[PDB]
């Protein structure tokens, strides 16, 4: 059968595994990477943001970006053949179609990568936990780059593919949504920091409980991949950590499952929070404190100070952040503190 | 600035407010204040807690 | 000031799952003790 | 009607109990203020 030998050749053993998932992984991922590379080098953001984001205009690696399309265009797909561009590559680049090109192609490449992990696991006959772990980054990308702009006015408020653009996104969400106060973000940061903690502590514990399997100071050469016995003393590490901390692991399977579990659930909680923000359902104010401060000008906490910072950043940033609104704020209108 | 639970704070807004700007970098243990109330007014507990935590 | 319905939410969400987990552990230990012959039936 | 052949038991370690109790209490601590508002 024609299908059978094609499947045989796709699963051929070579330098890089192609597989059936490769058919949509490789072109989509290649196109997304190429779109980002051309975007941060030639195309500009003059007509969508009134910025300069390209090496051709004099930006370095930290400031070049592929900016989101103009807010005048709504949630349009910005297809090259669409009514907004009608072919004519130059205008398609100018109005900001490259952002949608990169985002859609990267999302499909991401789907292809998860499928590739599934296929590799099936071919090698192991359990697919790797795809489940990779489901975290997929959720983050979908919630931040797709769902959040979809809930907002247009693609204009999605993050832009660039170093400084992501920083602008961070500050924008902090100023407008009080994103740091959202409990789901707190869960996400807890998960991420715990993942880094687990990685470092497990690496150190394993490397410092090695067995005497050689005679040289370099302990890296006392290991062989086709080894049956364990290379480090689980008992000694367990005793050390139970004497120092008070609780220690006693099950390698549970240890490694915990290492898998922490960052993934952190990312999933953060994604839930971002989906909530997409509808402006933000954890912004504590009503009780806002009141009690309103009826008495002596009450103050760090919380109210954060609110003042948010108001300042919002008022001072809106004029240049949203050029399509034509915001004009006179000097006497902008909130400012004392002499500074 | 209030930072205690019994002064209309919750777990998130509550905090141990750092010492006063008037003190600056000066060492401010309990026995240098004239009263414990004054020590609390200028944020001595922050200095105590932070130095002990570092050690 | 604060919502007077949270009290119920916070307290029930703290107590009911905690008692559920304590129940699971107690029944696991009771079954384990029953399996092994001894003073406990 | 009859004795079902599919009835198994249920287990929970003490470490699992500690993890569950810690999770429930920490979730309550995190969300209590937001519920109170």
């Amino acid at each position: 059968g024609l299908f059978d030998l094609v499947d045989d050749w796709l699963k051929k053993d070579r330098f890089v595994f192609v597989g059936w998932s490769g058919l949509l992984l490789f072109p989509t991922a290649y196109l997304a990477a190429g779109g980002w590379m051309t975007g941060t080098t030639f195309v500009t953001s003059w007509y969508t943001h009134g910025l300069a984001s390209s090496y051709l205009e004099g930006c370095n690696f930290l400031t070049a970006a592929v900016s989101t399309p103009a807010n005048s265009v709504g949630h349009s797909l910005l297809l090259l053949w669409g009514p907004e561009a009608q072919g004519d590559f130059t205008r398609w680049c100018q109005i900001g179609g490259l952002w949608t090109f990169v985002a859609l192609h990267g999302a499909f490449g991401l789907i292809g990568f998860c499928l590739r992990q599934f296929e590799i696991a099936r071919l090698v006959g192991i359990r697919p936990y790797n795809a489940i772990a990779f489901s975290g980054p997929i959720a983050v990308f979908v919630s931040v780059f797709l769902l959040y702009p979809l809930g907002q006015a247009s693609w204009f408020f999605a993050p832009s593919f660039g170093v400084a653009a992501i920083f602008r996104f961070l500050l924008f969400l902090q100023g407008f949504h009080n994103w740091t106060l959202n409990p789901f973000h707190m869960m996400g940061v807890a998960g991420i920091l715990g993942g880094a903690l687990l990685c470092a502590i497990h690496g150190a514990t394993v490397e410092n409980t090695l067995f005497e399997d050689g005679d040289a100071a370099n302990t890296f050469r006392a290991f062989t991949p086709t080894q049956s016995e364990e290379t480090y003393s689980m008992v000694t590490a367990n005793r050390f950590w139970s004497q120092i901390f008070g609780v220690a692991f006693s099950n390698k399977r549970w240890l490694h499952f915990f290492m898998l579990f922490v960052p993934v659930t952190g990312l999933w909680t953060s994604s839930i929070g971002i989906v909530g923000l997409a509808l402006n359902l933000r954890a912004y104010d504590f009503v009780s404190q806002e009141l009690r401060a309103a009826e008495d000008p002596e009450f103050e906490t760090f919380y109210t100070k954060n609110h003042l910072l948010d108001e300042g950043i919002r008022a001072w940033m809106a004029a240049q952040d949203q050029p399509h609104e034509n915001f004009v704020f006179p000097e006497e209108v902008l909130p400012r503190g004392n002499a500074l | 600035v209030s930072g205690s639970l019994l002064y209309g704070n919750n777990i998130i807004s509550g905090a141990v407010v750092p010492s006063s700007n008037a003190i600056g970098m000066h060492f401010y243990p309990i026995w240098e204040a004239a009263s414990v109330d004054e020590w609390l007014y200028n944020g001595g507990p922050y200095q105590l807690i932070v130095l002990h935590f570092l050690l | 000031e604060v919502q007077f319905g949270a009290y119920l939410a916070v307290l029930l969400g703290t107590f009911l799952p905690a008692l559920f987990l304590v129940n699971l552990f107690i029944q696991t230990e009771a079954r384990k003790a029953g399996k092994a012959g001894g003073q406990d039936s | 009607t009859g004795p079902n052949p599919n009835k198994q038991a249920v287990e929970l370690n003490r470490t699992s109990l500690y993890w569950g109790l810690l999770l429930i209490f920490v979730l309550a601590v995190l969300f209590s203020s937001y519920f109170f508002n």
Partner: peptide
């Protein structure tokens, strides 16, 4: 009155931590 709830939750968490250190399952080989 919510200060009582916050204090109760924090002390309960601390007690749970206490029981997980000195009343743990002893791991045997």
């Amino acid at each position: 009155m919510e200060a009582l709830v916050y204090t109760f939750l924090l002390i309960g968490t601390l007690m749970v931590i206490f029981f997980a250190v000195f009343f743990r399952e002893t791991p045997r080989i």
